[PDB]
Design a binder for this molecule. Structure first.
Ligand SMILES: *[C@@H]1O[C@H](CO)[C@@H](O[C@@H]2O[C@H](CO)[C@@H](O)[C@H](O)[C@H]2NC(C)=O)[C@H](O)[C@H]1NC(C)=O
Ligand SMILES: *[C@@H]1O[C@H](CO)[C@@H](O[C@@H]2O[C@H](CO)[C@@H](O)[C@H](O)[C@H]2NC(C)=O)[C@H](O)[C@H]1NC(C)=O
Ligand SMILES: *[C@@H]1O[C@H](CO)[C@@H](O[C@@H]2O[C@H](CO)[C@@H](O)[C@H](O)[C@H]2NC(C)=O)[C@H](O)[C@H]1NC(C)=O
Ligand SMILES: *[C@@H]1O[C@H](CO)[C@@H](O[C@@H]2O[C@H](CO)[C@@H](O)[C@H](O)[C@H]2NC(C)=O)[C@H](O)[C@H]1NC(C)=O
Ligand code: NAG
Ligand code: NAG
Ligand code: CA
Ligand code: CA
Lengths: 277, 277
């Protein structure tokens, strides 16, 4: 009775570990952009839920960076590529910038003019947790190169929920934090040496943070930080700013793709991860 | 009863498949040579046992390519690097060239001036199988660039036992074949587009054949053939030929290393493999 349970538990653990080890590597190439829709103002965000059961593919959409509390939900990708019909939901507080994420059926965003991370339910429409990001800048203090109140950037990867911000103690450099997806508590922090005001955008792939150089023109992935080894490396992986302005750029584990907001348009990039043995 | 046994069998199959998919990949670089021993004539063949019981790291040594029938049984690497004591075992027939292999508990070799593959026991000292390679050249008609009656090359990888030869029907190009480790029967054959007489050496990592361009001077991995997709590609992977003339270069999956014979010296290379996800 107990021996077979131990055997199946070991089997599940080994399957999970081996499939996670084969899941990702290091990025080496970014594909050409693919445009889905043209809507909204030049600044905004759009994403999908990674931990969603297959067959939902609900696209969440947000327009504006200063004063907005309306989020759009499209019931399918085909309902977002062509159909202009959506469901509008109202947030208790307006967000700042495009550094919001959707994960585990809830939206993580930043409160207006404050360093407060808020978890909001998109199904029950209620509030659970409103925590404070310890030692983080707000109100265009440590924004990206394009600005627009992007001081806090929330993302997810195969390991969980991460927040990229900057600390006055760490000059103005990029600081990575791993957050509990329930209590929004600090688990582990990595303090890098790349300034956030000269970044423009950043994303995380399964534990490695890739930081862009600029936002318009010759955009390229300039910086890489490995939190497991706590090391850094200057790369030169290039991509293409087709519409000459990038405001949001996030990595979505399930689709293994980079969702991007290109000058008021919704675009996708494809990553090329390699593993060395 | 049956359900848990089926679950255990599925767990074993998935573990084996996932560890084999995480094992090897496309070769990307070769490290500097490491010399272990200096003995014998300029041409010879030394190799280890991939599928061996733990605690049996016995190396196998052979000198000459024409009429020698004595093999050496240095029981340990420390007993081979420094100790000059060995056990000499006789063969029923002398070998041709430096292309032989030691797999599991037997040795596969070629029988004098014939296209005959012989399986010989290194413990019971008898013959179980002696077959003929179909349409394979012999007696210095489809040798390597260095000659020396290396018309048939035998190697092992994570998939099993492979033979590289050449066929009159396929001009003088390299032909790969998968052999049964027990019955020495042809399982599947692959046609490549690289002539064998201009090759010099070849080795298989896992289902991919890498072919060198020369034997003394500027040596590099020049050709690659994927038998799973049956596609060829010309690559440029230099490796350093420290001691001029090379005679044998084979791959060991257990150590994941290239064993080589460089002008009477025994050398080791540690390979680097990468996988794209
Ligand atoms: C995604 O959300 C579900 C639902 O909230 C999480 O399921 C919880 O799992 C924990 C432990 O596995 C249980 O203690 C909770 O009771 C579950 N929730 C409910 C409502 O039953 C799931 O863990 C979340 N995903 C991740 C990665 O945390
Ligand atoms: C966050 O980054 C800051 C910036 O360097 C780190 O602060 C330094 O920490 C070392 C050792 O802890 C001290 O010797 C320095 O005096 C600190 N500098 C300043 C300006 O206070 C901090 O350690 C980092 N946090 C973590 C968890 O690594
Ligand atoms: C390597 O050799 C061992 C034994 O020398 C092989 O083990 C045999 O396995 C089969 C089925 O798995 C049994 O029917 C035999 O009885 C085993 N041999 C002995 C002597 O007991 C092993 O299969 C060989 N490896 C490969 C890949 O074929
Ligand atoms: C390897 O190449 C040889 C020569 O190109 C092939 O032999 C020919 O096979 C075709 C069938 O596809 C016959 O029509 C020809 O008559 C054969 N040529 C000769 C000279 O006999 C051989 O079949 C190839 N092997 C494989 C596995 O594709
Ligand atoms: C690689 C490719 O040709 N297409 C991929 C595929 O995953 C899908 O069509 C799209 C949405 O996820 O992302 C991209
Ligand atoms: C190279 O491979 C050999 C094989 O045993 C061993 O010494 C070790 O794994 C490697 N040596 C290095 C990397 O110095
Ligand atoms: Ca981002
Ligand atoms: Ca060889």
């Amino acid at each position: 009775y107990d021996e077979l349970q131990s055997r199946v538990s070991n089997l599940e653990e080994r399957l999970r570990a081996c499939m996670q080890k084969l899941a990702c590597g290091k990025l080496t190439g970014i594909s050409d952009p693919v445009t889905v829709k043209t809507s909204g103002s030049r600044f905004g965000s759009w994403m999908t839920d990674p931990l969603a059961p297959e067959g939902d593919n609900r696209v969440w959409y947000m327009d504006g960076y200063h004063n907005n509390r309306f989020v759009r939900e499209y019931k399918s990708m085909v309902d977002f590529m062509n159909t202009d019909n959506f469901t509008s939901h109202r947030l208790p507080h307006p967000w700042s910038g495009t550094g919001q994420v959707v994960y585990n059926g809830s939206i993580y965003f930043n409160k207006f003019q404050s360093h407060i991370i808020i978890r909001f339910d998109l199904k029950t429409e209620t509030i659970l947790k409103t925590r404070s990001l310890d030692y983080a800048g707000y109100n265009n203090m440590y924004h990206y190169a394009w600005g627009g109140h992007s001081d806090i950037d929330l993302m997810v990867d195969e390991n969980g929920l991460w927040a990229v911000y900057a600390t006055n103690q760490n000059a103005g450099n990029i600081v990575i934090s791993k957050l509990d997806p329930v209590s929004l508590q600090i688990l582990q922090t990595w303090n890098t040496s790349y300034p956030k005001r000269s970044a423009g955008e950043a994303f995380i792939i399964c534990g490695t943070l890739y930081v862009t150089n600029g936002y318009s023109g010759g955009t390229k992935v300039h910086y890489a930080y490995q939190t497991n080894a706590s090391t850094y490396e200057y790369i030169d992986i290039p991509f293409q700013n087709k519409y000459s302005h990038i405001s949001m750029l996030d990595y979505n584990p399930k689709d293994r793709a980079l969702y991007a907001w290109n000058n008021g348009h919704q675009t996708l990039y494809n990553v090329t991860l390699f593993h060395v043995i």
